[PDB]
Amino acid sequence: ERPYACPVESCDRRFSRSDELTRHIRIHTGQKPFQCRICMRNFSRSDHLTTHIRTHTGEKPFACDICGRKFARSDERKRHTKIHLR
DNA sequence: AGCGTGGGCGT
DNA sequence: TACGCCCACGC
Ligand SMILES: [K+]
Ligand SMILES: [Zn+2]
Ligand SMILES: [Zn+2]
Ligand SMILES: [Zn+2]
């Protein structure tokens, strides 16, 4: 089911999509292709660079349906919304 | 809370 | 392959 395997001796993880294996390899090579223009920190993934930049800009696109409180990431809002339960 | 970052996936 | 979502986990 998951043909693409990690060729690293220490690792044993396997994947179903080659591009996921290609991504995974960066853990071992330590490559971080995506750099924040603001603080020069490097990141392994472009999507994580995007949410990181919001720490600098204060951009918060995700608002709680119940109280309107805003968050930088969707999963932050998700974690928050549940507090309005009983 | 604030956020790094891998997992799985659709496109 | 890249891009960028949700999703989850970790501190
Ligand atoms: K291996
Ligand atoms: Zn590996
Ligand atoms: Zn930065
Ligand atoms: Zn709320």
Side-chain angles (χ1 to χ4, degrees), chain A residues 3-11 14-86:
Chain A
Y4 307 97
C6 185
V8 176
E9 55 280 352
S10 305
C11 196
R14 317 183 92 253
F15 305 94
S16 70
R17 274 172 48 171
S18 64
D19 58 327
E20 190 170 348
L21 175 60
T22 296
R23 185 172 72 185
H24 166 79
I25 291 297
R26 299 202 189 102
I27 297 177
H28 302 299
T29 65
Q31 183 191 24
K32 299 179 179 299
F34 311 100
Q35 188 179 50
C36 175
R37 301 168 53 95
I38 293 156
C39 77
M40 299 300 168
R41 180 170 182 169
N42 304 286
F43 299 87
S44 65
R45 288 166 53 155
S46 61
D47 55 321
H48 290 342
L49 168 61
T50 296
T51 56
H52 161 78
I53 294 172
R54 301 194 180 132
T55 66
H56 297 306
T57 66
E59 185 192 11
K60 300 184 174 187
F62 307 95
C64 176
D65 285 335
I66 304 300
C67 72
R69 181 169 181 173
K70 302 171 172 295
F71 298 92
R73 310 201 316 224
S74 66
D75 61 293
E76 289 175 351
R77 173 180 59 189
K78 175 184 299 183
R79 187 178 67 178
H80 160 87
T81 307
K82 65 174 160 45
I83 76 172
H84 297 294
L85 293 185
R86 72 160 64 189

